[PDB]
Enzyme design. Structure first.
Site, short mmCIF file in Angstrom:
data_model
loop_
_atom_site.label_atom_id
_atom_site.label_comp_id
_atom_site.label_asym_id
_atom_site.label_seq_id
_atom_site.Cartn_x
_atom_site.Cartn_y
_atom_site.Cartn_z
N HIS B 161 17.30 55.31 32.93
CA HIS B 161 17.13 55.80 31.57
C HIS B 161 15.65 55.61 31.18
O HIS B 161 14.88 54.95 31.90
CB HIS B 161 18.02 55.00 30.59
CG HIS B 161 19.47 55.37 30.62
ND1 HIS B 161 20.32 54.97 31.62
CD2 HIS B 161 20.22 56.10 29.75
CE1 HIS B 161 21.53 55.44 31.39
NE2 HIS B 161 21.50 56.13 30.26
N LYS B 165 15.08 52.01 26.71
CA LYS B 165 16.46 51.54 26.90
C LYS B 165 16.47 50.40 27.92
O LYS B 165 16.66 50.64 29.11
CB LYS B 165 17.38 52.68 27.36
#
Ligand SMILES: NC(=O)c1ccc[n+]([C@@H]2O[C@H](COP(=O)([O-])OP(=O)(O)OC[C@H]3O[C@@H](n4cnc5c(N)ncnc54)[C@H](O)[C@@H]3O)[C@@H](O)[C@H]2O)c1
Ligand SMILES: NC(=O)c1ccc[n+]([C@@H]2O[C@H](COP(=O)([O-])OP(=O)(O)OC[C@H]3O[C@@H](n4cnc5c(N)ncnc54)[C@H](O)[C@@H]3O)[C@@H](O)[C@H]2O)c1
Ligand SMILES: [Ca+2]
Lengths: 272, 278
Positions: B161, B165
């Site tokens: 990601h 994140k």
């Protein structure tokens, strides 16, 4: 767990099954039946010498087996021509059996087991982990109609005539809203292309089953990929051992259900 | 489409914007008012052909009053921040406002409880990418039907990601939960979190344009001897899967409200079971 008689221990799958049974700690019955025109012989499977006997001696051999191993389960990896006769023989002798051999008349095979109440597993696909994948994809497909509609499906396949497994998975995928005719499957036949594109080791060109399913959104931004790649016979050997453990338990429990398939074995959980 | 109008809070958020764009492009009526978070000023933004008056969250009472009078059948779509989940949900449920919430985090049990007990028409899901939900469900189905089926196999899970994140994906955790029921032995901290841009490009195949918005997942299941190999990937670039799944959820919930259903709280599984409405 029950002792096992593997017919034919000298066949390629039957040998792998007997090996895997011994390595897992099953008792291998030191007797086996081989096919027409093969002669009697002594073979070694792990640390066990097996007296391999001609099929014409099956009445006598089975009596020798049954007297020393009352609770035996037969495992059958022979040939399509033997399937129906072998089954009728196992059912006439009361012998519980696990039938891996493909072909023959399948409705007749099932009905002889069911009508005779013989504890048995009949499964032309014993690669249990693949069976689980295929079945779950179907149950999911039935649960979520049109979930992938508008997506593009690509299916590429390597075996040695499209794979029944691939067709079954494609059928489920249509219920998800994917449009894909059976002819759109790309069969990889060229060994160079089997090695390079699919990553099949040189070892297993004559004995493999590699499948890839790619599902892509029409805008390109969502990519799903599913692969199940099988090299050689181990998955079938291991699957057969698990089937023998399952069937042994059901005989031990005196179960009212007698004829099982690989789906039943999968639903029984792991036993090793 | 006799579908409800939608208020997207926050339409200046990355996901809220994508949702609002997709709603307008699909032919839904976007309410020209939105709520933005603490610290953010009031402003006006353009979404498709729609000018949205974006108002500060402290203006919430009067803004929602204005919306309810102008758009009585409004469904609120909530893509805000974890610190707002429970407060926002409790607010919508007090006003009887139906809502679709994709915001992650907060007290999930408290979120579902207040929706259920208030009888508010709602869809609450931390993953609105319905196609990804269908894959997660496929794995859970396999594990429920066929427990231990992969006992003795080795599991590798790798996940990528955007660098911000900094915690493993909820989808990966739920998939791993199913795989454990399938007989795999795998702790949560064994997930390999690819977060370095160079590695994301070369190892995972993340296009450069999507480095700040993607969700790539690879699960590898291998037999002890190495002869059987399963691999499942699901790779999302950007946010359009979430925006599209959110539109589907709005059209679903909209129908349930019109039909006057006894059932009030739904998730994306329920939406998937309704079939494609587009
Ligand atoms: N269920 C599965 O998942 C699975 C997997 C792999 C192969 N198969 C099938 O299993 C079968 C065996 O494959 P293989 O490559 O081991 O074949 P193979 O030719 O290597 O071995 C078959 C053996 O059966 C013997 N035989 C023939 N008739 C017999 C009889 N009446 N009694 C006892 N033995 C007999 C033959 O002499 C031979 O040794 C085939 O039908 C194949 O398609 C099934
Ligand atoms: N369910 C899904 O499918 C899905 C997919 C992707 C992201 N998400 C989640 O959605 C949320 C938002 O992601 P993002 O990248 O858009 O974040 P973002 O920071 O880009 O946007 C969030 C916006 O919410 C605003 N906000 C904060 N508190 C608020 C309040 N009380 N009222 C109104 N607005 C408020 C912020 O000012 C910000 O602009 C995150 O929790 C993320 O995990 C969910
Ligand atoms: Ca021989």
């Amino acid at each position: 767990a029950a002792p096992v008689m593997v017919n034919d221990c000298t066949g390629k799958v039957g040998q792998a099954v007997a090996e895997a049974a011994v390595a897992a700690g099953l008792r291998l019955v030191p007797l086996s039946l081989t096919g027409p025109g093969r002669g009697g012989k002594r073979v070694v499977i792990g640390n066990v010498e097996v007296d391999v006997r001609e099929v014409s001696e099956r009445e006598d051999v089975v009596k020798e087996v049954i007297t020393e191993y009352p609770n035996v389960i037969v495992v059958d990896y022979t040939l399509p021509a033997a399937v129906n006769d072998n089954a009728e023989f196992y059912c006439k002798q009361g012998l519980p059996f696990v039938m891996g051999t493909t072909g023959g008349d399948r409705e007749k095979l099932l009905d002889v087991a069911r009508k005779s109440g013989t504890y048995s597993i009949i499964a032309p696909q014993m690669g249990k982990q693949v069976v689980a994948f295929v079945a779950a994809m179907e149950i999911m497909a039935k649960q979520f109609p049109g979930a992938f509609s508008g997506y593009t499906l690509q299916v590429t396949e390597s075996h040695q005539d499209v794979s029944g497994t691939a067709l079954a998975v494609i059928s489920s995928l249509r219920k998800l809203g994917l449009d894909f005719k059976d002819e759109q499957v790309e069969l990889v036949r060229d060994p160079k292309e089997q090695m390079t594109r699919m990553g099949v080791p040189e070892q297993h060109l004559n004995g493999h089953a590699f499948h890839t399913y790619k599902i892509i959104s029409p805008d390109g931004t969502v990519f799903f990929e599913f692969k199940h790649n099988v090299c050689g016979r181990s998955i079938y050997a291991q699957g057969t051992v698990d089937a023998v453990l399952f069937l042994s338990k059901k005989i031990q429990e005196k179960s009212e259900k007698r004829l099982y398939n690989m789906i039943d074995v999968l639903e029984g959980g792991s036993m090793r």
